[PDB]
Every structure is written in C-alpha cells, then in structure tokens.
C-alpha cells in the first residue's frame, strides 16, 4: 500500500548478463545493508559466459556495482588413477544467490563435471556447484555435493540408482537461521530431484582448493526412490524453510516439485531428516504448481503460512475456453498437530500469459499494522505485458483478494520484471521494510522504498 513507485533506484549490470536473475539483501558485520545480485550470463575474463555476482551498496541514485570475485578457471586433478575435471563454461554463476550473516552463497547450477579412468568416464554432466564468499575477510569456499568418481557403466549395472550426475545443485537455495545451507537439485537421482544440506561453517572448514572431491561429514542429502510418481518431478526446483510442527528446536523444509506425478505438480513439507510431514497436490497439469514457494505468517497468529505458485495455471472462461494466467495458493497453518488442509485463498492472474505467481516474496510488515504482507510477481503481466508486481496486505482472515498496490514494470518488453523478488529488509533505515525487484531481461534491479 505504501511502496513509492515514483522514487525508484535502478542498479544496472552489463548487456546480456541477466543481472537481476536472482538477488538478496546482504548485511555486513557492521550492520550495513547491501544488495547481492546474480548475473548468470556475465562473460568471464576470456569472453566466455561464466556468470557473475555483484555486491551493490545502498545508494539513492543506484548505478553500477562491484563484482564479487570468484575463481572462473577450470580444474583438473589426476589422483587415484583417475582424472577429475571441472568445467565452468556456461555454468550460470549467480543463477541463484542467497545471504546469511556475513556469508554470501552464489551457485552455478549448470557447472559441468567429469571423471576419466582409462577409456571409461563418469560422463560430462551438470552436477552444479556453489561458491561461498565472506566479503569482509576475503575467504572463499565451495560446495558441490553431487560430484562423484563412479564410471558410466556402474550406474547402468545398478539401474541408474543414486545417480547424482545431473543434480544441478544450487538451482534453488535457502539458509536456515542456524546456518545450514539447503540446496535444490531438481536433476538429482535421474531428474527426480534432491536436496543437499550442510552447515555453512563446515563447508568453509572442509574446503581446500584443488581437491575437487572432498567429504563434508555433517552433510545430509535426501533420498532416491523408484516410485513412478516422483519420476521427472524436479523435486527441488524451489525450496524454502519454516516452522510447521510446533517444535521450535527443529526446522522444517518446504520443497517444490512442479512436474511431480506426471506433471501434476506438488509441494512438500518435510523435517530435517527428509521425512515427509505433508504433501500439497497441484490443481491442474502443466501449471507448474511448485515453481514458487514462500513461507510467512500473514494472519498474525504466530504460525507460519505456506504460499505456493503455479504460474502456468489456466483459468476457465465462457464457452469451455481456458486462459493461461497463473495462480497463487495460500495455506494458513492451523493449531496443534493438524495437517494443512485445502487452500484458505486462491489468487489468480488477470493477464493472458502473465505468469502470476512466478515469484512470491514475503515483504514483512509493509504498513506496520501487525499482519505480514507479501508481493506476487506476474513477469509478463499488465495490459502491455511488460510485467507487474502486486502487493497483498495481511489480515486476521488471511490475505485480501484485491491487491493493495500494483507496481508496473518501468523497463521495456522482455525484461521479466518480477522474475526475482525480495523484501522484509529496511535498506534505507526508515523503519519500513522495502522491496527489490529483478528484471534480468533488461539487466537491472529496481529498489522500491516503503514510506509512511
């Protein structure tokens, strides 16, 4: 209701870099808020696409940002009569970026990997990898839990079980408050999908350069399955964390599986051991129910609610005609040991091909009335199709059906305005939480300040 749309700040990256594909607020040990931006098609130092990360400091005027530096050199290690190989060309560094304390974790989901042993090989495949940075010290670490040294043949002999060769780890990422990094790997287990968890501290302390295959003892990966419902489900396309079992001493994981059960889609709430606690099923096939997942208490009762996005949902219209507009589903958490029932509210897009629900950002309390608010992206919405982000204020009954405010893309056609979003952080120190919106198509980020 109170994001100023006239007073904007534009941060810009280089052409064709997809600067703004992903972003997050980052806070240094001093307390100063900055904006980390991911640019998955940034040219490396030898004019080949490697992707890149930028750390933007808060300015009213905005402008260009400094490049958070990472090692873009490929690595080879001949060890144990094998040849380990990393390939960073077209790895998409900054396809996702997340911050926690004084660390930043930017991932390259399509970083390739191979192992050669005489005439045989593991196969050159996109295991993915995450680069971890600590700006104020300069420390760097990596985490690539899907790398292996198993030759192609052995997977065939074992019916492709425990096949992590195509994980694309870091496709999605989130960090718990304790400092456990959780990665989405929708290619995991032959495109079932998987999650890999590891304490940020333990990643840093077990990493050394040039090793390539190393053990992070405290890590916890999810499991493979031979249940056809999970096949090609992309479980981990999106990921999130929250509190859904009443016990504050444990953390629950929210996983999006948008093509689960023959493209029906699903989202699951799980414990830290990856035992399923609940499963929400998609309403309509190919709608990509699970593309987005957001956790926030919107009705002021202290229990986290779940928001799921299905951006390709087709709405029914006059004379049996369908219209792709996109849909967001709200699930308010009830009291005690009781499952998440049917949706408390359905929000549906209005523009054809608008992809409403492509991103869902908890805004915190935008108007400081007590109830938390959210932002929902329609990257190709608005009458022109340039994009649109819609604010929804929270209330006792959940959310409002009608949006409180509508942000129209200031960038030209194709920008994907709203493809990325983040809030709940006060960047200018005025008491109200703000919103950063990414337009990778236009290589920019728009910062909207909340005002009284």
């Amino acid at each position, epitope marked *: 209701l109170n994001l100023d749309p006239v007073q904007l700040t534009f941060y810009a990256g280089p052409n064709g870099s997809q600067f703004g594909f992903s972003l997050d607020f980052h806070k240094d040990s001093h307390g100063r808020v900055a904006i980390v931006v991911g640019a998955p098609r940034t040219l490396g130092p030898s004019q080949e696409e490697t992707g890149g990360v930028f750390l933007c400091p808060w300015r009213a005027e905005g402008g260009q940002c400094p490049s958070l530096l990472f090692d873009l050199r490929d690595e080879t*290690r*001949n060890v*144990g*009569s094998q040849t380990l190989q990393t390939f960073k060309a077209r790895q998409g560094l900054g396809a996702s970026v997340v911050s926690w304390s004084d660390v930043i974790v930017a991932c390259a989901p399509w970083q390739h990997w191979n192992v050669l042993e005489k005439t045989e090989e593991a196969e050159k495949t996109p295991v993915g990898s995450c680069f971890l940075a600590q700006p104020e010290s300069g420390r760097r670490a990596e985490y690539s839990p899907c790398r292996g040294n198993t030759l192609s043949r052995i997977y065939v002999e074992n019916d492709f079980s425990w096949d992590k060769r195509y994980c694309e780890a870091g496709f999605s990422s989130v960090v718990t408050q304790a400092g456990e990094l959780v990665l989405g790997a929708p290619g995991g287990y032959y495109f079932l999908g998987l999650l890999a968890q590891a304490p940020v501290a333990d990643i840093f302390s077990s990493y050394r350069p*040039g090793i390539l*295959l*190393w*053990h992070v003892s405290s890590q916890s990966l999810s499991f493979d399955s031979s249940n056809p419902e999970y096949f090609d489900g992309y479980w981990g396309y999106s990921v999130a964390v929250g509190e859904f079992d009443g016990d504050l001493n444990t953390t629950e994981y929210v996983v999006g599986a948008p093509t689960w059960s023959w493209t029906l889609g699903a989202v699951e709430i799980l414990d830290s051991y990856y035992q399923r606690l609940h499963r929400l099923r998609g309403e309509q096939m190919a709608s990509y129910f699970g593309h987005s997942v957001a956790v926030t208490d919107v009705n002021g009762d202290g229990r986290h609610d779940l928001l799921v996005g299905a951006p390709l949902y087709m709405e029914s219209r006059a004379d049996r005609k369908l219209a792709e507009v996109g849909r967001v589903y709200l699930f308010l958490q009830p009291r005690g040991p009781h499952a998440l029932g049917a949706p408390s509210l359905l929000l549906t897009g209005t523009q054809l091909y608008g992809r409403f629900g492509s991103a869902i950002a908890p805004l915190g309390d935008l108007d400081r009335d007590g109830y938390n608010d959210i932002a929902v992206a329609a990257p190709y919405g608005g009458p022109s199709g340039r994009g649109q982000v819609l604010v929804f204020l929270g209330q006792s009954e959940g959310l409002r059906s009608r949006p409180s405010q509508v942000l129209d893309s200031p960038f030209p056609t194709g920008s994907a305005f709203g493809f990325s979003l983040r809030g709940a952080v006060d960047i200018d120190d005025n008491g109200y939480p703000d919103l950063i919106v990414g337009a990778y198509g236009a290589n920019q980020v728009a910062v909207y300040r909340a005002q009284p």
Partner: antibody
Amino acid sequence: EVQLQQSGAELVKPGASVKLSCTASGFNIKDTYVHWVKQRPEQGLEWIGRIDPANGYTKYDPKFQGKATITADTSSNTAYLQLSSLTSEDTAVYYCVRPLYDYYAMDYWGQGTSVTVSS
Amino acid sequence: DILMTQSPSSMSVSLGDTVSITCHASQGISSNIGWLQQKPGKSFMGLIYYGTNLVDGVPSRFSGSGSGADYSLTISSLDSEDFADYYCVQYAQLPYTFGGGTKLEIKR
C-alpha cells in the same frame, strides 16, 4: 571425535586364516573409503587395499590379491581384513586408515593390530 | 608402481632446530602426497594432506612444500615430542606407495 578402533592382537598358525576388524567411532564407516595398511620393521609400510563401505566395491595391490579380502558391514559400522593362507611374511602390524577431507587421502589411522604367524 | 624415495633415513638433531625431510617420486604426482608421523611405540598421525594442507589439530611448526616429483616436510623449532618417525605416502595412482621413512634422533 573420529576414531578407528581395531581388534586385539592375533596369534595364528601358518596355513590358517585370520580376520581383523576396524570399527568406526564418532562417525559412520560408509562416510569414506577405508584402507588397510601393513607395517613391518624391515620392509616398512605396504598398502593392501581399500573398500567403499557404502557399496562394497574394493581395490587391491596385486601383491595381496588372493590373500587379502576386505569387507565392511554398515549395520555394525565395521570394516574387515581377512588374510588366508597365512605365511611368516604375514607377521606384521595391520592398520585401517581413512581420510579427513580429501577423498583420496590417508589421514586418520587405527592403533594397529599385531598378527604373529607361528607354529 | 610409483617409487617413493625418502631422505635422509635418519638425522641427529637438537631441540629448536629447523629440519626438512625430502621425498622424491619416480614420476610426477602433482601434490597428491601425504605426510605421516609415528612416535615410538605409538600409532600413526596424519600431518599434511595434498602437499601443503595441515590436518586438523596439527601444530603450525609443520609445513609442506614442493611440486612435480619432489616434496619436503619441514619442522621449524623442534619440540621434544617431534623426535619420531615420518613417512610420505603418494595417492597419484593405485596402488598407494610409501617412502622408506626418516627417523629424527636426539643429538649428543
């Protein structure tokens, strides 16, 4: 605290077999490769082989192929070295070894198990 | 099989000395080398992995160096606890091979 606890000293007869054990403590035996190494005063340290207890696959130095059989059991969290056709050359101290971080390294070691072949 | 020739086999040294143990491979092993310590009667403790990286808990005074086929362990300012045997192991190729060993001895 990562620790490899090996079974006690063995007094075995030539021609017989013996099976040494190495039990994980403060970690799971499937976490990494587990190796077995031979030490003798004159000849020194010799690498016997390894196992990946997650899947059972093993490797051996051709010198110990046939004599040595490494196995592991994740239920009991233990790796084993079995030596058949015991000769006087098998009198040695035997260690199980695992890496700290690097997959291929040899960092953590058991206290060793003494085997004396004698009639 | 790669041969690991370690040198010297023994040295007589004093507390406070800085000493070095070399270890030469029969072919290049691109830092895929470990350093081990065995104290009298005791078992083994890992000192260095992958050429230069100290194992967790190992004191600052130990360091590794070298490249290709020639590497060195250096102990700076010998503590009385450092009078022991030391070995190198390579893991560039299977089978893993060890060095002969170097025994640090108390000079008098």
